[PDB]
Structure formats: C-alpha cells, structure tokens
Amino acid sequence: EVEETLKRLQSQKGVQGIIVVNTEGIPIKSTMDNPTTTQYASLMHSFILKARSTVRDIDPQNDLTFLRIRSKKNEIMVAPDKDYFLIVIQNPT
Amino acid sequence: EVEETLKRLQSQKGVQGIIVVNTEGIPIKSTMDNPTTTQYASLMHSFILKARSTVRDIDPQNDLTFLRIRSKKNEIMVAPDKDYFLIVIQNPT
Amino acid sequence: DGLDVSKEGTEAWEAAMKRYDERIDRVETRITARLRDQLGTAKNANEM
Amino acid sequence: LTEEEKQQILHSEEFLSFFDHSTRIVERALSEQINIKLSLNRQFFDERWSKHRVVSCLDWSSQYPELLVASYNNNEDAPHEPDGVALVWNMKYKKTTPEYVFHCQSAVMSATFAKFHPNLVVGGTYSGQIVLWDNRSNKRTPVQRTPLSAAAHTHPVYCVNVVGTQNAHNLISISTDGKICSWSLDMLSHPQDSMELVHKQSKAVAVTSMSFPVGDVNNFVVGSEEGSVYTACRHGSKAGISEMFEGHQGPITGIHCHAAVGAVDFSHLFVTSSFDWTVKLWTTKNNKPLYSFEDNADYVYDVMWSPTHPALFACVDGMGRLDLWNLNNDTEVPTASISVEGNPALNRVRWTHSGREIAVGDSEGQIVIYDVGEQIAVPRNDEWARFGRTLAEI
Structure with missing residues (x-):
C-alpha cells in the first residue's frame, strides 16, 4: 500500500512532511513543495552514500x-536497506 | 573533571573511557588502537564536515x-561542540 | 506419660509404643519394598 | 599539531561548554532499546601420527582457550616411524588434522602450554629431557632441549608446568626419580634450581603426578608411584616434602588441587586418583582421606576438578566410562556417566579453562571432546554454601 503508509508514518507525530522514496535520490514526490523535497532528498542521498562508504571503511x-x-x-x-531512503522533517524536540 | 568524564563515559556499554577528536582528525585522547582510531576519526571528521555543509545549505x-x-x-x-568531537562506540543492545 | 509413676501407666505407655512400633513396621515394610524393587542391579554401592 | 599543545589546551578552562555537551549527549544516549547432559561435541584423531600411540597428557591454552595439546607416546608399530609426537588441536574451526604437529626424538610423556610465551609448547619426554616447541619455527624438531646431565632430569619426566606471573615465571618439572627443577622459560641450558625430593631421611619419592594449588606457587601437592601423596614447599627453609599421607594401596595416577574461587576458600582440598578405582576427595589440613568413591572392577587414570564448579570433577576409567561426580547433588552415584564407544581404556582428562566443556584421552589416540549439560556444568551462588555444608557433614 502507499497512502496508508505515508498517512501512518506522518500522523504519528503530525510530521510536517514525508514522501516515499524507493529510488536512489531524485524523488518526484512532494509533500509541501517540489524543490525543498526533491533537492533536499537528493542531497540526503548523496550524503548517505558517503556515510555508507564511511561505515564500510572500518x-x-x-x-x-x-x-x-x-x-x-x-x-x-x-x-x-537497498533503495528505501526515508525523509522526515520534524522539530528538534 | 576530565577523570570524572572518563569514569562517567566508561560506565556506558561497550565504551572504553572517553576519546576526543579535534578538528585535525587526531584524537586528543587515546583509548583505542591508534592507527585504526585515527583513520576512522579522519573519515568521521570529513563526513561530519560535509554534513555541516549540507545542513547549512538550507x-x-x-x-x-x-x-x-x-x-x-x-x-x-x-x-x-566546536573543536572537540566525541566519538563513542556502543553496542546496539 | 511422664513423671507418672503408676506401673499401669507404664503399661498404657507400652500399648502406645506398640502402636508406635506398628507404624514403625509399616515403615519397615515400605523401606524394604523400596529396597527390593530397587534391587537386582549389582553389588556396587547404590545397587546393593 | 604534536602531542604537547593538546595537553595545555586540555588544561585550559574553556571546557565548561564541552563538559555540558558531553553531559547532555551521555544522559540522552543512556536509554537503549532493541531494533526488533553428556554430549560428544567433537573428535580429534590423527592417522599419520596417531596409529596406536596412546594419549598421555592434555592441556588447554589459557591465552587461547581454543587450543589443546596432545602427547602421543608409545611407538611399537614401526620403529622407523617417529617415536614421540605432540599434537596441538584447535577448537574455533573443525578440521580433520591438528593445526600443528611436533615430533620429538624420544617419546613425549607429558606436555603443556607455556604461559609467558603464547607461541610455545613445552613437554617432558621419557628420556628425561625437557623439550621445547616454538610454533614460529617451521622445524618439527625441538627448538631448545635440556641436557641429560645429573643436574637436569635423567629419568622419565611425567610432570611439567610453567607458573608465576607474566613477569615472574618458573617452568617447574618433576621427574619419576623425584628431582624437582625450575627453569627460566627462555633459558633451558641450565637448571636454575633443582632439589631431589626425599621423604623421611633416605627415602626418595617415586613421583608420578603434581598439582600447584590455585594462586600458591610455593607449596603444592605431589602424588607418588607408591600410593602416598605428599605436600611439598617449592621454596623456603622447609623446601621439600612436608607431609606423609596414608592414601591408597595403589599407585597414584592423578592429582589435582581445587579449581574454583569466589566464595569461602576450598584450596586446601585436592582430589587424587589411585590405581584401584579409588578417587579421594580430600584436603591438606586433615590427614585422613575424607571420602573414598569406589565401584567398578577397573581403576581410574586421571581426575580433574571443574574449573568453574566448586564441586564437580571428572573421572577416567579403564572400561572407557567417563563419569562426572557432582558432590553436592550426590555423593554415591556418578552424577553423569557415559562410556565412549569401543570400550577403550581412557587415560587422561583435561577440562577446558572455560569449564563449559571437557576433553578425554584414549588408548588408541582418538581424543574425544565432550560437552556437558548447562545445569550440570555451571554452579550457582548457593552452590558454594551447599558444598560447605556437605563437607561439614563428615
């Protein structure tokens, strides 16, 4: 399922915005606007690839x-895990 | 007290005292094997700096x-914090 | 019975203790039964 | 830059922010959650070096609890084949072959791991020479060899053991003639100390087993070939035999002090394994054998206290039965008892330092690694009190 997944992942805390990303970065989904979602998720994907390299170093x-x-x-x-890259915008608290 | 900090940190699971890494990638405190911890802290410093850039982007x-x-x-x-970067190895359990 | 010094009191005590020995012989039968039903293995220690 | 300015910057007093940082992160990181019986354990039996050649001694490496030294002695099938062979067998991975093989000119009659050198195996042979084996070297020949002089052992040495701290060691060895000698592990060219064990004036001791009590290195217990166990002092004014024990009417074939700690002491206790199936739970302070476990037609060959259970101890037999006696649980029947197949006369037992698993010797060379039930191996905190009470029984 799709809509139930996002709905339950969101209302658990009234999360500001999440979109489902099953591909390596560049998601076309949006939750509050296209840019702040897509570009930020691409930056996250680039960063986590490096982080995966870092954990593989040791x-x-x-x-x-x-x-x-x-x-x-x-x-x-x-x-x-293999392509499932989460995004969560939420307050620090 | 540095020693108080060390005894407080070593009480944590899978943690050997307190090891602190400055902005040069060389741990100011020594608690584990020097080469592995130094290279590991260097990669740590690199990717935390790129994460800092990533967050400051937006x-x-x-x-x-x-x-x-x-x-x-x-x-x-x-x-x-600003120069002292605590790295703590802890079991997931 | 206790400081009771009537010899017939001793006789009543003897009846009480022959009843005691009746229970005791019940015990003897039980322990001998467990003996024999646990026997037949060999001579050594926990066998005989 | 270098490791001096860091010391002063640590001595600098701007660390209140860093201290608050560490306090917050530690206190926030404190919470943790998750994300989501006697058994044949193993076999070890060479074929090239273990054709007949009965087992003689076994040991586990304290530094490497996965390693076991064997010592296969008798050569009768082929005089041309190696006379004495020592095998070291690993535990981490299962292989049909020993991890390393060592061949000594003579027949090796006892062996053990060195404590100081974690890469060295030292054994006593039948000729009387203490023999080294450096596992760094690729030469199967002994690396260093003690001389067969009057100063050193000249009789079949059957007891060798290195003890002391990592910075204060002494390879003790006592041979069948009874001459104790200590060597430095790194220098075996000369006996750094020796003394011939003698009982009451002009009475040598046909020594055939020894055991140092846990911790103590100055006084120990020795088991003669003449059935009479003694206690000796390794070093001191009274250096030598200090006790005469009635013991048993058969030659002693094994001895061992207690092997547990943590509660009320029991180190004064030690079990001997005689030659008429008479293992003797029994203490140094007293003089009468405390108890006399007996059964069987055959007779024991070795007995070892459990490294972890302050009551349990193994017991070999000539009919191939190995039985664990848990004294607290019972004192008359073996708590556990199973016979290895083919009824061969087992000849040695050596519990793993972990205490979770037991080894056994063999009359044909097939070392069997037995595992034990969890309830039958690990003692409880109450176990020590129960042991004390049982001893207090008689």
Whole structure:
C-alpha cells in the first residue's frame, strides 16, 4: 500500500512532511513543495552514500540500516536497506 | 573533571573511557588502537564536515551535536561542540 | 506419660509404643519394598 | 599539531561548554532499546601420527582457550616411524588434522602450554629431557632441549608446568626419580634450581603426578608411584616434602588441587586418583582421606576438578566410562556417566579453562571432546554454601 503508509508514518507525530522514496535520490514526490523535497532528498542521498562508504571503511561487510541527525533546528531521518531512503522533517524536540 | 568524564563515559556499554577528536582528525585522547582510531576519526571528521555543509545549505542557523550511525555490529555516537568531537562506540543492545 | 509413676501407666505407655512400633513396621515394610524393587542391579554401592 | 599543545589546551578552562555537551549527549544516549547432559561435541584423531600411540597428557591454552595439546607416546608399530609426537588441536574451526604437529626424538610423556610465551609448547619426554616447541619455527624438531646431565632430569619426566606471573615465571618439572627443577622459560641450558625430593631421611619419592594449588606457587601437592601423596614447599627453609599421607594401596595416577574461587576458600582440598578405582576427595589440613568413591572392577587414570564448579570433577576409567561426580547433588552415584564407544581404556582428562566443556584421552589416540549439560556444568551462588555444608557433614 502507499497512502496508508505515508498517512501512518506522518500522523504519528503530525510530521510536517514525508514522501516515499524507493529510488536512489531524485524523488518526484512532494509533500509541501517540489524543490525543498526533491533537492533536499537528493542531497540526503548523496550524503548517505558517503556515510555508507564511511561505515564500510572500518569493515566492508558493515552496512547502514538506520540514520538520524537531531540538531538544534531539525531532526532528519533515513533508514536505507537497498533503495528505501526515508525523509522526515520534524522539530528538534 | 576530565577523570570524572572518563569514569562517567566508561560506565556506558561497550565504551572504553572517553576519546576526543579535534578538528585535525587526531584524537586528543587515546583509548583505542591508534592507527585504526585515527583513520576512522579522519573519515568521521570529513563526513561530519560535509554534513555541516549540507545542513547549512538550507539551515544556516543549525548546529550539529547528535548523529546515530548504527549498524548490525555497533553504533558510533559522534558529537562535535566546536573543536572537540566525541566519538563513542556502543553496542546496539 | 511422664513423671507418672503408676506401673499401669507404664503399661498404657507400652500399648502406645506398640502402636508406635506398628507404624514403625509399616515403615519397615515400605523401606524394604523400596529396597527390593530397587534391587537386582549389582553389588556396587547404590545397587546393593 | 604534536602531542604537547593538546595537553595545555586540555588544561585550559574553556571546557565548561564541552563538559555540558558531553553531559547532555551521555544522559540522552543512556536509554537503549532493541531494533526488533553428556554430549560428544567433537573428535580429534590423527592417522599419520596417531596409529596406536596412546594419549598421555592434555592441556588447554589459557591465552587461547581454543587450543589443546596432545602427547602421543608409545611407538611399537614401526620403529622407523617417529617415536614421540605432540599434537596441538584447535577448537574455533573443525578440521580433520591438528593445526600443528611436533615430533620429538624420544617419546613425549607429558606436555603443556607455556604461559609467558603464547607461541610455545613445552613437554617432558621419557628420556628425561625437557623439550621445547616454538610454533614460529617451521622445524618439527625441538627448538631448545635440556641436557641429560645429573643436574637436569635423567629419568622419565611425567610432570611439567610453567607458573608465576607474566613477569615472574618458573617452568617447574618433576621427574619419576623425584628431582624437582625450575627453569627460566627462555633459558633451558641450565637448571636454575633443582632439589631431589626425599621423604623421611633416605627415602626418595617415586613421583608420578603434581598439582600447584590455585594462586600458591610455593607449596603444592605431589602424588607418588607408591600410593602416598605428599605436600611439598617449592621454596623456603622447609623446601621439600612436608607431609606423609596414608592414601591408597595403589599407585597414584592423578592429582589435582581445587579449581574454583569466589566464595569461602576450598584450596586446601585436592582430589587424587589411585590405581584401584579409588578417587579421594580430600584436603591438606586433615590427614585422613575424607571420602573414598569406589565401584567398578577397573581403576581410574586421571581426575580433574571443574574449573568453574566448586564441586564437580571428572573421572577416567579403564572400561572407557567417563563419569562426572557432582558432590553436592550426590555423593554415591556418578552424577553423569557415559562410556565412549569401543570400550577403550581412557587415560587422561583435561577440562577446558572455560569449564563449559571437557576433553578425554584414549588408548588408541582418538581424543574425544565432550560437552556437558548447562545445569550440570555451571554452579550457582548457593552452590558454594551447599558444598560447605556437605563437607561439614563428615
């Protein structure tokens, strides 16, 4: 299913915006506008590819399955397994 | 107290005291094997800096102190203040 | 019975203790039964 | 830059922000959640080096609990074939061959791992020479060899053991004639100390087993070939035999001090394995054998205390049965008892330092690695008190 997935992933906290990304970056979906979603998700994809390289450095068998950065202004979410790259815009708290 | 910080940190699971990495990639504190931790901290510093650039692209007022690089083996807690970057190896359990 | 010094009191005590020995022989039968039903294995230790 | 300015900047007092940072991140990172019986364990039996050639001694490496030294002694099939062979067998991965093979000129009669050198195996042979084996070298020949002089051992040495701290070691060895000698692990050219064990004046001891109590290195217990166990002091004014024990009417074939710690001490206890199926739970402080487990027609060959359970101990037999006696659980029947197939006379037992698994020797060379039930292996915290009470029983 699609709509139920986003609806449940969103209303759990009244999340500002999430779109489903099953491809490597460049998502055409949108939740609040096309740019702030697409370009930011592409930047996230580029960053997490490097992060995956980083985790593979210490041992190549390692892979990143879960990633969160909680900063003073935003909390960014992504849980990659093979192509499933999450995006979450949410308050730091 | 630095020693108080060390004893507080070592109490955490899978953590060997406190190891602090400056902006040069060389850990100011020594707790693990030097070459592995130095290269690991250098890659750490590089990708946290590119993450800083990434966030400042759209968030020119946010600061980075929290990041959960978790794998199926261990999680690394990386926390930069301004020069001292704490790296903490902890079991996911 | 206790400090009771009536010899017939001793006799009543003897009846009480022959009843005691009746329970005791019930015990003897039980322990001998467990004996024999646990026997037949060999001589060594926990066998005989 | 270099490792001096960092020290001063650490000594600088701008760390309140850093300290608050560390406090916050640690206290926030504190919460953690998740994301989502006796058994034949293994076999070890060479064929090139283990045709007949009965087992003689076994040991586990303290530094590498996955390694086991064997010592296959008798050569009777082919005089041309190697006389004495020592095998080291690994535990991490299963292979049909020993990880390394060592051949000594004579017949090796005992062997063990060195503590200081984690890459070295030292064994005593039948000739009387203490023999090294450096696993770095690619030469199967012994690396360093003690001389067969009057100063060193000149009789079949059957007991070797290196003890002490990592910075204070002494390879002790005592031979059948009874001459104790200590060597430096790195220098075996000369016996750094020796002394001939003697009982009451003019009475040598036909020594055939030893065991150092855990921790102590100065006093120990020795088991003679004459059925009478003794306690000796390794170093001191009373250096030598200090006790005469009635023991058993058969030659001692094994001895071992207690192998557990954590609660009320039991190191004064030690079990001996005699030559008439009479293992003797028994202590140094007393003089009478505390108890006399007996059964069987055959007779034991070795006995070892469990490294973790302060009651359990193994017991070999000539009919091939290995039985674990858990004293607290019971004192009359083997708590566990199974016979290896083909009823061969087992000859050695060596518990793994972990205590979770047991080895056994063999009359044909097939070392069997037995595993044990969890409930039958790990003792409880109450177990020590129960052991104390059982000993207090008599």
